[PDB]
PDB file of C-alpha atoms and ligand atoms in Angstrom:
ATOM      1  CA  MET R  21      97.438  59.198 121.618  1.00 51.91           C
ATOM      2  CA  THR R  22      99.688  61.746 119.885  1.00 49.96           C
ATOM      3  CA  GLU R  23     100.044  65.235 121.468  1.00 48.02           C
ATOM      4  CA  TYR R  24     101.325  68.397 119.732  1.00 43.56           C
ATOM      5  CA  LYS R  25     102.608  71.264 121.948  1.00 40.16           C
ATOM      6  CA  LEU R  26     102.185  74.651 120.204  1.00 41.75           C
ATOM      7  CA  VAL R  27     103.037  78.174 121.262  1.00 43.03           C
ATOM      8  CA  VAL R  28     101.406  81.394 119.921  1.00 42.23           C
ATOM      9  CA  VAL R  29     103.559  84.506 119.839  1.00 42.21           C
ATOM     10  CA  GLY R  30     103.535  87.966 118.349  1.00 41.64           C
ATOM     11  CA  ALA R  31     102.971  91.644 119.187  1.00 40.61           C
ATOM     12  CA  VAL R  32     100.165  92.780 121.415  1.00 42.49           C
ATOM     13  CA  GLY R  33      96.823  93.218 119.732  1.00 41.58           C
ATOM     14  CA  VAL R  34      97.442  90.984 116.704  1.00 40.54           C
ATOM     15  CA  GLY R  35      94.809  88.374 117.760  1.00 42.26           C
ATOM     16  CA  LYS R  36      96.775  85.640 119.496  1.00 44.24           C
ATOM     17  CA  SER R  37      94.112  85.210 122.127  1.00 41.95           C
ATOM     18  CA  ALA R  38      91.210  85.574 119.662  1.00 41.56           C
ATOM     19  CA  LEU R  39      92.786  82.930 117.368  1.00 43.59           C
ATOM     20  CA  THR R  40      93.346  80.495 120.222  1.00 44.72           C
ATOM     21  CA  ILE R  41      89.846  80.906 121.604  1.00 44.61           C
ATOM     22  CA  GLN R  42      88.270  80.433 118.125  1.00 44.85           C
ATOM     23  CA  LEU R  43      90.298  77.238 117.849  1.00 41.84           C
ATOM     24  CA  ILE R  44      89.349  75.941 121.305  1.00 42.01           C
ATOM     25  CA  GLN R  45      85.858  77.306 121.972  1.00 43.01           C
ATOM     26  CA  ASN R  46      84.586  78.172 118.456  1.00 42.65           C
ATOM     27  CA  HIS R  47      83.599  81.780 119.078  1.00 45.50           C
ATOM     28  CA  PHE R  48      85.173  85.199 118.506  1.00 45.00           C
ATOM     29  CA  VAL R  49      85.983  87.081 121.716  1.00 44.85           C
ATOM     30  CA  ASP R  50      85.380  90.882 121.632  1.00 45.35           C
ATOM     31  CA  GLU R  51      87.894  91.539 124.331  1.00 45.69           C
ATOM     32  CA  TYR R  52      90.362  89.390 126.214  1.00 42.69           C
ATOM     33  CA  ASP R  53      92.768  90.998 128.659  1.00 42.25           C
ATOM     34  CA  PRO R  54      96.046  91.590 126.729  1.00 43.59           C
ATOM     35  CA  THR R  55      98.104  90.548 129.758  1.00 46.05           C
ATOM     36  CA  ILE R  56      96.564  87.126 130.369  1.00 45.46           C
ATOM     37  CA  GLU R  57      98.632  84.124 129.447  1.00 43.28           C
ATOM     38  CA  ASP R  58      97.148  80.676 129.640  1.00 42.10           C
ATOM     39  CA  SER R  59      97.296  77.266 128.118  1.00 44.05           C
ATOM     40  CA  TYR R  60      94.542  75.429 126.355  1.00 44.31           C
ATOM     41  CA  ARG R  61      93.978  71.864 125.366  1.00 39.36           C
ATOM     42  CA  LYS R  62      91.651  70.113 122.927  1.00 36.59           C
ATOM     43  CA  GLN R  63      91.249  66.731 121.279  1.00 36.53           C
ATOM     44  CA  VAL R  64      90.909  67.178 117.520  1.00 38.71           C
ATOM     45  CA  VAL R  65      91.159  65.112 114.329  1.00 39.31           C
ATOM     46  CA  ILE R  66      93.801  66.404 111.920  1.00 42.10           C
ATOM     47  CA  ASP R  67      93.958  64.546 108.614  1.00 39.00           C
ATOM     48  CA  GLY R  68      92.212  61.551 110.214  1.00 37.44           C
ATOM     49  CA  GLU R  69      94.630  61.478 113.138  1.00 33.04           C
ATOM     50  CA  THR R  70      92.971  61.883 116.525  1.00 32.68           C
ATOM     51  CA  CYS R  71      95.329  63.928 118.661  1.00 34.75           C
ATOM     52  CA  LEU R  72      95.671  66.311 121.542  1.00 35.91           C
ATOM     53  CA  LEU R  73      96.706  69.950 121.049  1.00 38.84           C
ATOM     54  CA  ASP R  74      98.350  71.700 123.968  1.00 42.54           C
ATOM     55  CA  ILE R  75      98.675  75.440 123.270  1.00 35.51           C
ATOM     56  CA  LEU R  76     100.216  78.385 125.051  1.00 31.92           C
ATOM     57  CA  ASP R  77      98.661  81.771 124.337  1.00 32.08           C
ATOM     58  CA  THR R  78     101.501  84.055 125.278  1.00 34.11           C
ATOM     59  CA  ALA R  79     101.175  87.562 126.682  1.00 34.11           C
ATOM     60  CA  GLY R  80     104.748  88.882 127.054  1.00 37.11           C
ATOM     61  CA  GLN R  81     104.582  89.600 130.802  1.00 35.81           C
ATOM     62  CA  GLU R  82     107.571  89.842 133.193  1.00 34.54           C
ATOM     63  CA  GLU R  83     106.498  87.742 136.175  1.00 35.71           C
ATOM     64  CA  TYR R  84     108.079  84.292 136.253  1.00 31.17           C
ATOM     65  CA  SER R  85     105.902  81.442 135.041  1.00 28.92           C
ATOM     66  CA  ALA R  86     107.398  78.003 135.164  1.00 27.30           C
ATOM     67  CA  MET R  87     104.666  77.068 132.711  1.00 27.02           C
ATOM     68  CA  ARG R  88     105.867  79.622 130.166  1.00 25.82           C
ATOM     69  CA  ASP R  89     109.429  78.334 130.523  1.00 26.84           C
ATOM     70  CA  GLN R  90     108.264  74.690 130.096  1.00 25.87           C
ATOM     71  CA  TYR R  91     106.348  75.529 126.909  1.00 24.29           C
ATOM     72  CA  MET R  92     109.333  77.370 125.392  1.00 24.57           C
ATOM     73  CA  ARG R  93     111.610  74.435 126.296  1.00 26.52           C
ATOM     74  CA  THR R  94     109.377  71.541 125.144  1.00 25.15           C
ATOM     75  CA  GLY R  95     107.045  73.318 122.725  1.00 25.94           C
ATOM     76  CA  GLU R  96     107.304  71.718 119.329  1.00 22.63           C
ATOM     77  CA  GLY R  97     106.038  74.418 117.010  1.00 21.10           C
ATOM     78  CA  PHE R  98     105.281  78.158 117.021  1.00 21.81           C
ATOM     79  CA  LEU R  99     102.705  80.372 115.429  1.00 24.94           C
ATOM     80  CA  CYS R 100     104.215  83.808 114.751  1.00 26.51           C
ATOM     81  CA  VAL R 101     101.266  86.190 114.403  1.00 25.83           C
ATOM     82  CA  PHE R 102     100.988  89.669 112.932  1.00 25.57           C
ATOM     83  CA  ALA R 103      97.917  91.598 111.815  1.00 24.29           C
ATOM     84  CA  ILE R 104      97.570  92.598 108.145  1.00 23.51           C
ATOM     85  CA  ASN R 105      96.467  96.109 109.198  1.00 19.88           C
ATOM     86  CA  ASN R 106      99.375  96.684 111.531  1.00 20.92           C
ATOM     87  CA  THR R 107     102.645  97.268 109.868  1.00 21.44           C
ATOM     88  CA  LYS R 108     104.571  97.517 113.167  1.00 20.86           C
ATOM     89  CA  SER R 109     103.363  94.065 114.148  1.00 24.00           C
ATOM     90  CA  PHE R 110     104.784  92.717 110.881  1.00 23.42           C
ATOM     91  CA  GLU R 111     108.117  94.534 111.574  1.00 22.91           C
ATOM     92  CA  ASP R 112     108.213  92.889 115.019  1.00 24.98           C
ATOM     93  CA  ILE R 113     107.918  89.264 113.606  1.00 25.26           C
ATOM     94  CA  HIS R 114     111.622  88.837 113.188  1.00 28.21           C
ATOM     95  CA  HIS R 115     112.332  89.488 116.928  1.00 28.25           C
ATOM     96  CA  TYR R 116     109.978  86.678 117.859  1.00 25.72           C
ATOM     97  CA  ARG R 117     111.476  84.218 115.363  1.00 26.61           C
ATOM     98  CA  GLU R 118     114.984  85.082 116.685  1.00 27.12           C
ATOM     99  CA  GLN R 119     113.887  84.474 120.307  1.00 26.79           C
ATOM    100  CA  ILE R 120     112.548  81.100 119.253  1.00 25.19           C
ATOM    101  CA  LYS R 121     115.750  80.163 117.459  1.00 24.92           C
ATOM    102  CA  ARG R 122     117.726  80.943 120.623  1.00 25.31           C
ATOM    103  CA  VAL R 123     115.503  78.866 122.894  1.00 24.58           C
ATOM    104  CA  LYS R 124     115.944  75.876 120.555  1.00 23.29           C
ATOM    105  CA  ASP R 125     119.466  76.700 119.476  1.00 23.57           C
ATOM    106  CA  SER R 126     118.225  75.764 115.998  1.00 25.86           C
ATOM    107  CA  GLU R 127     117.444  77.461 112.681  1.00 25.00           C
ATOM    108  CA  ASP R 128     115.049  74.576 112.017  1.00 25.19           C
ATOM    109  CA  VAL R 129     112.062  75.018 114.390  1.00 26.66           C
ATOM    110  CA  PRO R 130     108.557  74.212 113.173  1.00 27.01           C
ATOM    111  CA  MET R 131     106.825  77.515 112.612  1.00 28.26           C
ATOM    112  CA  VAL R 132     104.066  79.184 110.697  1.00 23.90           C
ATOM    113  CA  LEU R 133     103.702  82.833 109.822  1.00 25.68           C
ATOM    114  CA  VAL R 134     100.143  83.999 110.431  1.00 30.92           C
ATOM    115  CA  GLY R 135      98.678  87.142 109.004  1.00 32.53           C
ATOM    116  CA  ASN R 136      95.497  87.736 111.025  1.00 28.64           C
ATOM    117  CA  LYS R 137      92.505  90.129 110.663  1.00 27.38           C
ATOM    118  CA  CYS R 138      92.152  89.367 106.981  1.00 26.99           C
ATOM    119  CA  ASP R 139      88.464  90.370 107.253  1.00 26.04           C
ATOM    120  CA  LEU R 140      89.595  93.978 107.437  1.00 28.59           C
ATOM    121  CA  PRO R 141      89.843  96.020 104.251  1.00 30.14           C
ATOM    122  CA  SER R 142      92.586  98.413 105.369  1.00 30.01           C
ATOM    123  CA  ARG R 143      95.477  96.098 104.637  1.00 28.31           C
ATOM    124  CA  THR R 144      98.904  97.644 104.875  1.00 30.56           C
ATOM    125  CA  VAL R 145     100.888  94.395 104.817  1.00 30.93           C
ATOM    126  CA  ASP R 146     100.295  92.758 101.442  1.00 33.55           C
ATOM    127  CA  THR R 147     100.195  89.026 100.674  1.00 35.98           C
ATOM    128  CA  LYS R 148     103.342  89.243  98.632  1.00 37.65           C
ATOM    129  CA  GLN R 149     105.266  90.920 101.463  1.00 39.70           C
ATOM    130  CA  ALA R 150     104.290  88.202 103.888  1.00 41.39           C
ATOM    131  CA  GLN R 151     104.716  85.407 101.408  1.00 40.73           C
ATOM    132  CA  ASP R 152     108.202  86.681 100.710  1.00 40.21           C
ATOM    133  CA  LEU R 153     109.205  86.890 104.393  1.00 38.75           C
ATOM    134  CA  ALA R 154     107.955  83.347 104.955  1.00 38.16           C
ATOM    135  CA  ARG R 155     109.841  82.117 101.906  1.00 38.50           C
ATOM    136  CA  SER R 156     112.977  83.742 103.419  1.00 38.20           C
ATOM    137  CA  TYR R 157     112.367  81.851 106.724  1.00 36.05           C
ATOM    138  CA  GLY R 158     111.413  78.653 104.869  1.00 34.48           C
ATOM    139  CA  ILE R 159     108.080  78.323 106.615  1.00 32.94           C
ATOM    140  CA  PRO R 160     104.407  78.460 105.585  1.00 30.99           C
ATOM    141  CA  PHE R 161     102.330  81.630 105.545  1.00 29.11           C
ATOM    142  CA  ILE R 162      98.610  81.395 106.391  1.00 28.14           C
ATOM    143  CA  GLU R 163      96.089  84.236 106.242  1.00 28.28           C
ATOM    144  CA  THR R 164      93.460  84.218 109.011  1.00 27.92           C
ATOM    145  CA  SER R 165      90.584  85.966 110.564  1.00 29.57           C
ATOM    146  CA  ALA R 166      89.610  85.073 114.115  1.00 30.83           C
ATOM    147  CA  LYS R 167      86.444  87.155 113.446  1.00 31.91           C
ATOM    148  CA  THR R 168      85.073  85.077 110.556  1.00 29.12           C
ATOM    149  CA  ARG R 169      86.979  81.981 111.587  1.00 30.27           C
ATOM    150  CA  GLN R 170      88.728  82.038 108.262  1.00 29.49           C
ATOM    151  CA  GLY R 171      91.938  80.016 108.136  1.00 27.60           C
ATOM    152  CA  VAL R 172      91.915  79.303 111.867  1.00 26.24           C
ATOM    153  CA  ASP R 173      92.116  75.533 111.764  1.00 26.17           C
ATOM    154  CA  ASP R 174      94.416  75.743 108.751  1.00 24.55           C
ATOM    155  CA  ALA R 175      96.946  77.835 110.707  1.00 22.75           C
ATOM    156  CA  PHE R 176      97.121  75.445 113.750  1.00 24.37           C
ATOM    157  CA  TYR R 177      96.845  72.287 111.628  1.00 22.58           C
ATOM    158  CA  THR R 178      99.504  73.441 109.255  1.00 25.49           C
ATOM    159  CA  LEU R 179     101.825  73.921 112.230  1.00 25.58           C
ATOM    160  CA  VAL R 180     101.073  70.343 113.293  1.00 27.12           C
ATOM    161  CA  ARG R 181     101.952  69.164 109.783  1.00 27.18           C
ATOM    162  CA  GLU R 182     105.265  71.074 110.108  1.00 26.98           C
ATOM    163  CA  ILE R 183     105.883  69.287 113.389  1.00 27.97           C
ATOM    164  CA  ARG R 184     105.175  65.905 111.789  1.00 25.14           C
ATOM    165  CA  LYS R 185     107.890  66.643 109.139  1.00 23.40           C
ATOM    166  CA  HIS R 186     110.493  67.615 111.763  1.00 24.07           C
ATOM    167  CA  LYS R 187     109.769  64.410 113.668  1.00 23.33           C
ATOM    168  CA  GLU R 188     110.818  62.450 110.585  1.00 25.44           C
TER     169      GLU R 188
HETATM  170  N1  GDP L 201      88.538  92.458 112.806  1.00 24.50           N
HETATM  171  C1  GDP L 201      89.201  91.544 113.557  1.00 24.50           C
HETATM  172  N2  GDP L 201      89.477  91.853 114.816  1.00 24.50           N
HETATM  173  C2  GDP L 201      90.252  90.914 115.496  1.00 24.50           C
HETATM  174  C3  GDP L 201      90.718  89.700 114.842  1.00 24.50           C
HETATM  175  N3  GDP L 201      91.463  89.047 115.782  1.00 24.50           N
HETATM  176  C4  GDP L 201      91.412  89.765 116.896  1.00 24.50           C
HETATM  177  N4  GDP L 201      90.792  90.915 116.726  1.00 24.50           N
HETATM  178  C5  GDP L 201      90.512  91.945 117.728  1.00 24.50           C
HETATM  179  O1  GDP L 201      91.709  92.646 118.036  1.00 24.50           O
HETATM  180  C6  GDP L 201      91.772  92.879 119.462  1.00 24.50           C
HETATM  181  C7  GDP L 201      93.065  92.191 119.956  1.00 24.50           C
HETATM  182  O2  GDP L 201      92.908  90.777 119.916  1.00 24.50           O
HETATM  183  P1  GDP L 201      93.636  89.823 120.958  1.00 24.50           P
HETATM  184  O3  GDP L 201      93.243  88.415 120.646  1.00 24.50           O
HETATM  185  O4  GDP L 201      93.360  90.386 122.343  1.00 24.50           O
HETATM  186  O5  GDP L 201      95.206  89.971 120.617  1.00 24.50           O
HETATM  187  P2  GDP L 201      96.489  89.502 121.412  1.00 24.50           P
HETATM  188  O6  GDP L 201      97.008  90.685 122.185  1.00 24.50           O
HETATM  189  O7  GDP L 201      97.444  89.128 120.288  1.00 24.50           O
HETATM  190  O8  GDP L 201      96.038  88.374 122.276  1.00 24.50           O
HETATM  191  C8  GDP L 201      90.508  92.321 120.093  1.00 24.50           C
HETATM  192  O9  GDP L 201      89.525  93.372 120.389  1.00 24.50           O
HETATM  193  C9  GDP L 201      89.994  91.362 119.041  1.00 24.50           C
HETATM  194  O10 GDP L 201      88.563  91.224 119.076  1.00 24.50           O
HETATM  195  C10 GDP L 201      90.290  89.424 113.510  1.00 24.50           C
HETATM  196  O11 GDP L 201      90.709  88.468 112.870  1.00 24.50           O
HETATM  197  N5  GDP L 201      89.616  90.458 112.944  1.00 24.50           N
HETATM  198 MG1   MG L 202      96.176  87.976 124.268  1.00 26.93          MG
END
């Protein structure tokens, strides 16, 4: 069976953990310690293909984790998450993409730009802004809400589709 190794990155508070838990466990977590980094696995069917997802929910801590290092080394695609009501988190995206490029020594890493918390009306990062930054990176942009579970499977599945392209 096919496995896809995914890594979720972005500034604190954007909803990395909430997005991963909605994907895995199908509920919206009210709070999840911002410092906790763990990996999650699930068997899913994407486009009729039964597969295993293996996901790292990063937390940007300093202590050595071999696991973290192994996911950055062998991880096949990356979700780069900002929140649509947090301009600073959008300004921070580029730093994360650049880290990822350096780990892979490649400009061509499967990636999706995720604009989360789209349930919220106070949107300071507009669709066009995000769509334009993604077009500059040559990656997809997907709007999500871990709260309403809007776009959640689309974001992760899209990243799998980007991995399938790279593999060919
Ligand atoms: N309104 C709303 N709140 C969210 C959404 N995603 C996460 N949050 C909340 O924002 C806070 C930070 O989320 P978290 O997943 O801990 O972010 P992380 O630091 O990126 O892991 C939590 O209290 C979440 O419940 C969402 O899509 N909409
Ligand atoms: Mg978290």
